[model samples]
Target chain A: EKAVVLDEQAIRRALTRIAHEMIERNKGMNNCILVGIKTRGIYLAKRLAERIEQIEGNKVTVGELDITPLVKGADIPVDITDQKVILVDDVLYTGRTVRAAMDALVDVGRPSSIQLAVLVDRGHRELPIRADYIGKNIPTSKSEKVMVQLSEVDGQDLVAIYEK
Target chain B: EKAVVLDEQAIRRALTRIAHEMIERNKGMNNCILVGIKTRGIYLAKRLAERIEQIEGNKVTVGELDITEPLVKGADIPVDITDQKVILVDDVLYTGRTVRAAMDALVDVGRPSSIQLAVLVDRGHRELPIRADYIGKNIPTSKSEKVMVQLSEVDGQDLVAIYEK
Candidate 1:
């Protein structure tokens, strides 16, 4: 009832490519900051930050935003006024999470720009939000589920699809 | 009379070493940003950013901070870096007045998690408590002498020299 789409190596390669693309698109790391959604996204942000440091001698700032209480509204811990922020999340499902994250981000401070980066972009958007940087694009039906596993939280790193 | 202490190659090597030292001390590049004091500092910051990118494969953000104006009046900076680790870059750490003014401007703009200084040359004459977290070279000199650094980007050739005025 489950199929593996991305393994550990695939995920690593995807992130590496994403990091390179981010730098290339921005034409350098000027005025950029990474804000990861809570849980797995935070880990991804940390990993991406380390990889970037390995490639660029300069460090990139990484922050965590917990949108659990965002429905009611919550304070964003990091000040992102006039910053070019990259929003990081694990999976782009229904696009509601990103919508909520953006709402929370806008509530705290105004960013010059905001870009989305997702590990897996499974097609089933109930909303119009789309990923700027996608690790993998997989089309799915409403009955199926796409799951992401990380070694930090899970025993291994992988992206799996399940038929429910 | 002027005497050259560091040529182009020497300057490049020193910058590379400084970049590596900065990465080592910081324990990784997370939550870090570089702000260059205006004029030569801006050029140095860009060069450093390129070197860092060459080594790490990630582009490091570089911004300019002009301290020529008074800090109390405020100055325009390109980046908003709140709660981020800041590395203030400059060509030389002289009397530390420039650095003090830079710090004031940065404080007015936003609150950084921490601020560290990085300089190519530290000609000792500490008028302020400021000290470089990363230093390229240390040259002792009399108060009357001047330490001059000329980069190829600005000058005909890259060199670090000392002159008596």
Candidate 2:
């Protein structure tokens, strides 16, 4: 597999496109709730929620899920049950993180339906799961990385691919 | 009952004296937490805590208890609780509305061996079951006149006086 790199502009365009497509596919943003996976995913979820609200004039509640095992510090955990949850992330390389998130969500209660939204879909699937909505599909090798940096969290807005 | 007003100088002097007395009485600031009953009580508690730290050179934690029925906006609620002696403080003790309310909130947190009340002025009026353990001065006053306690940390002055309205 060859590593494909994505730039910042491409990532932003992909997010904007996903936001519009979400409204189009869902028919409206009235019953939707955006829940971001912890750290980077939470920020991405908030940005998507803001853009969706701007486009559809419908506000979506943004919640965060912290599934990290490290407990140096802890904030208020989310409670999502029987709600339309759209799980968001910066990049979806492996489906394991999303799987863990789904397990965590189930502890609170079952949602109406669970959907995945990612800014970048760097495909390398070990599990049988797939993204419902993708920003861009950048097929990359095992050694390559897709990093989505936002202004709110990273002090700048940009996306880059690096080899490690 | 007549109101005995203690001015800012008198309040500071009382605190300086209390700082020494608390050290002498408790043997130190160790195993003690000062809790102020919202508003003015918190400020006086902080002042006492600062003086205690200065005298003993040991750090002491301070807490604030909101004791108003409506529970005014911007109330700082303490989420953590530990088993330690708490010195409850207030500015002026009238009908003990503020102190009683503070006690109710404190009981919800954690249990302590003892909780003592410290006040700048003890005006004798008992509508509720409350009494001050440490009294700076006892002032007798009419029901119409208000007892104003000004601390330097709050208004750059410390004075306990009667304001007739």
Candidate 3:
């Protein structure tokens, strides 16, 4: 297994950078909804919301979407219409998760637009998608794996890359 | 922790008895909708529905209610209510978080003529305004305690008892 360290300071810095980039790209957090794919993505979404709140002095609503292979029982009841959705994920790999999330969002309604955000953008995309905002991009072999652990989900803050 | 065992045989028997009791008390499962609370109660509701089916040969709709604490982040969806009777079931009745949340979720879709609760075990000392309609066993105990209900739904056994956590 290969180790890729993402310290707390690095994560905090990434959130600030992502928040600024989002503000610059979208103009502001207005009409924006941060939807985090379940597991680690939820933490990233919350952290991003915190950063955006600090920058804009306004609360950004954050929602969670589970795009795992297995069908989870929980579903968000919030209505999403004409809302700018920034889909957040821990790590971007083959893009299967983002694809599933896109499919799931269809039933809710077509958003104004959807953007992808990732903590780590490890290369080797088997699908046709990319992150709009990324923390770090690490190109690795197809056999290697990237795991991002957040204190909100895993009781700690660190990122690990391992072999299958 | 104290040990208590309820084997598969006991579970089948209790289900058979509950099915008969339900029939004897309410005439049938026609107006009775078995709403199982999440995890274990859902299974118990399924078993009860199966037994009711065998006895009456009429299939009743099985719905699930995920009654958890309102403060808890994740809660499963509540089924659509279109004038169907509702019976909420749980594995064990302790502080009544399961039932209270179930009722809260149920009220959103529509109102039922009546809402009943069925539990495998009714261990008393409730913190909320909740009661059970069909209780297999009622074991009174202290607050710093627990009651384990093993059913063929989750565990391979069908029994209920109290234990100190």
Tens digit of lDDT per residue, candidate 2, span B17-89?
Answer: 7667777756697878788875788888888989999878897778886655325333353534446667787
Once fitted onto the true fold, the runs of candidate 1 whose alpha carbons sit more than 4 angstroms away are A1-164, B69-77
lDDT accuracy of residue A115 in candidate 2: 75
Worst 10 residues of 1 chain A by lDDT: A69-78
**TM-score of predicted structure 3:** 0.48
Could you tally the backbone clashes for each prediction?
A: 9, 9, 1
- The docking category that best describes candidate 1 is incorrect
List model 3 lDDT by residue over B4-73, tens digit each. 7455666677677877887776568875677777678878888888888888888766776554423322
Residue A54, model 1: lDDT of 82
**DockQ of candidate model 3:** 0.01
Shift of residue A89 alpha carbon in model 3, Å: 0.3
- lDDT of candidate 3 at residue B163, scale 0 to 100: 79
Query: Among the candidates, what TM-score does chain A have in each?
Result: 0.91, 0.84, 0.91
